[PDB]
Write an enzyme that holds these catalytic residues in place. Structure first.
Site, PDB file in Angstrom:
ATOM      1  N   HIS A  40      34.475  49.276  37.613  1.00 54.97           N
ATOM      2  CA  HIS A  40      35.946  50.077  37.123  1.00 54.97           C
ATOM      3  C   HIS A  40      36.395  48.106  36.341  1.00 54.97           C
ATOM      4  O   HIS A  40      36.744  48.253  35.396  1.00 54.97           O
ATOM      5  CB  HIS A  40      37.020  49.704  37.859  1.00 54.97           C
ATOM      6  CG  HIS A  40      37.866  48.812  38.551  1.00 54.97           C
ATOM      7  ND1 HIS A  40      37.225  48.392  40.186  1.00 54.97           N
ATOM      8  CD2 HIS A  40      38.720  47.809  38.431  1.00 54.97           C
ATOM      9  CE1 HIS A  40      38.173  47.482  39.682  1.00 54.97           C
ATOM     10  NE2 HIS A  40      39.047  47.254  39.417  1.00 54.97           N
ATOM     11  N   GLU A  62      29.274  23.933  35.382  1.00 55.78           N
ATOM     12  CA  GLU A  62      29.272  25.367  34.648  1.00 55.78           C
ATOM     13  C   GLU A  62      28.289  25.939  33.579  1.00 55.78           C
ATOM     14  O   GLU A  62      27.048  25.462  34.052  1.00 55.78           O
ATOM     15  CB  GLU A  62      30.493  25.098  33.633  1.00 55.78           C
ATOM     16  CG  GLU A  62      31.551  25.430  34.024  1.00 55.78           C
ATOM     17  CD  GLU A  62      32.280  24.336  34.358  1.00 55.78           C
ATOM     18  OE1 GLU A  62      31.576  23.135  33.658  1.00 55.78           O
ATOM     19  OE2 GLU A  62      33.842  24.081  34.471  1.00 55.78           O
ATOM     20  N   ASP A  84      32.497  52.064  43.649  1.00 54.06           N
ATOM     21  CA  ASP A  84      33.061  51.237  42.530  1.00 54.06           C
ATOM     22  C   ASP A  84      32.080  50.173  42.776  1.00 54.06           C
ATOM     23  O   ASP A  84      31.868  48.885  43.433  1.00 54.06           O
ATOM     24  CB  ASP A  84      34.391  51.341  43.217  1.00 54.06           C
ATOM     25  CG  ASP A  84      34.850  49.941  41.753  1.00 54.06           C
ATOM     26  OD1 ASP A  84      34.132  49.538  40.191  1.00 54.06           O
ATOM     27  OD2 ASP A  84      36.269  49.301  41.831  1.00 54.06           O
ATOM     28  N   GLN A 174      45.435  41.732  41.640  1.00 57.04           N
ATOM     29  CA  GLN A 174      44.961  42.220  40.562  1.00 57.04           C
ATOM     30  C   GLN A 174      44.173  41.171  39.603  1.00 57.04           C
ATOM     31  O   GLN A 174      44.301  39.804  39.924  1.00 57.04           O
ATOM     32  CB  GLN A 174      45.753  42.698  38.959  1.00 57.04           C
ATOM     33  CG  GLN A 174      45.817  44.119  39.680  1.00 57.04           C
ATOM     34  CD  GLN A 174      46.985  44.653  40.496  1.00 57.04           C
ATOM     35  OE1 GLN A 174      48.062  43.931  41.190  1.00 57.04           O
ATOM     36  NE2 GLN A 174      46.706  45.629  41.069  1.00 57.04           N
ATOM     37  N   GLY A 175      43.260  40.990  39.299  1.00 58.87           N
ATOM     38  CA  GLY A 175      42.625  40.044  38.447  1.00 58.87           C
ATOM     39  C   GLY A 175      40.612  39.169  39.075  1.00 58.87           C
ATOM     40  O   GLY A 175      40.468  38.702  39.177  1.00 58.87           O
ATOM     41  N   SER A 177      39.583  41.751  41.340  1.00 63.44           N
ATOM     42  CA  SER A 177      38.254  43.127  40.801  1.00 63.44           C
ATOM     43  C   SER A 177      36.919  42.842  40.768  1.00 63.44           C
ATOM     44  O   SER A 177      36.527  41.573  39.697  1.00 63.44           O
ATOM     45  CB  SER A 177      38.633  44.104  40.120  1.00 63.44           C
ATOM     46  OG  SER A 177      40.071  44.567  40.989  1.00 63.44           O
TER      47      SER A 177
END
Ligand SMILES: [Ca+2]
Length: 223
Positions: A40, A62, A84, A174-175, A177
């Site tokens: 998703h 990074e 998923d 949320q975020g 995922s």
């Protein structure tokens, strides 16, 4: 992550941020060229950001690598969230080091009661919104399948497990995922869904990675 703690910079070295101009999902680095995330979370234009702590500041560890290909699971159903899971290939191989490191795939499924680490840059509130810039972590146990089904009647497939606290207060959100659930050094889950975040009797629901090891390995071997 609601009710978690600040991980510390680069303490979760397999955690990635998927970026399309902004952070939108987590993922897990499984080798130098491949990330696992949630189906998703699919979109075009993904840049994989490795070695992140503060996602809004360049801190010096990074690696930013664009995706060359995205492979959503063949049986993903976006209505049920069954299956998923997706794989993302990097255009160039990451340089692996103490801060940017793969996580091993499981060799067997984890059991209810096992302790795991869940991590991400998602919402830290169950009501309202506050997105952290540094990575947050939560230690939480896998819940029994009967407790998971009882919490979410009609919704939990054999490709899902619950983890967290039925009393509420501690969950992914949320975020988060697409991010990892790691138990004893193995990737056992992917942050998938839940009803709100951190609500009583509504634990987090995670993709059950051990069902997908054969698919992951065969896919990597031919792509
Ligand atoms: Ca950064």
């Amino acid at each position: 992550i609601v009710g978690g703690y600040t991980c510390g910079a680069n303490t979760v070295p397999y955690q990635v941020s998927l970026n399309s101009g902004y952070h939108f999902c987590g993922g897990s680095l499984i080798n130098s060229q491949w990330v696992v995330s949630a189906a998703h979370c699919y979109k075009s234009g993904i840049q994989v950001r490795l070695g992140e702590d503060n996602i809004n500041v360049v801190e010096g560890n990074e690696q930013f690598i664009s995706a060359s290909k995205s492979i959503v699971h063949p049986s993903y159903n976006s209505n049920t969230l069954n299956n998923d899971i997706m794989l993302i290939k990097l255009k160039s191989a990451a340089s692996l080091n103490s801060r940017v490191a793969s996580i091993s795939l499981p060799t067997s499924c984890a059991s209810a009661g096992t302790q795991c680490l869940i991590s991400g840059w998602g919402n830290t509130k169950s009501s309202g919104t506050s997105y952290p810039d540094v990575l947050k972590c939560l230690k939480a146990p896998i819940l029994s399948d009967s407790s998971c089904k009882s919490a979410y009647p009609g919704q939990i497939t054999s490709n899902m497990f619950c983890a967290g606290y039925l009393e509420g207060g501690k969950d992914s959100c949320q975020g988060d995922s697409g991010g990892p659930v790691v138990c004893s050094g193995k990737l056992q889950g992917i942050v998938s869904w839940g009803s709100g975040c951190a609500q009583k009797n509504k634990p987090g629901v995670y993709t059950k990675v051990c069902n997908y090891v054969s698919w992951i390995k065969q896919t990597i071997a031919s792509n």
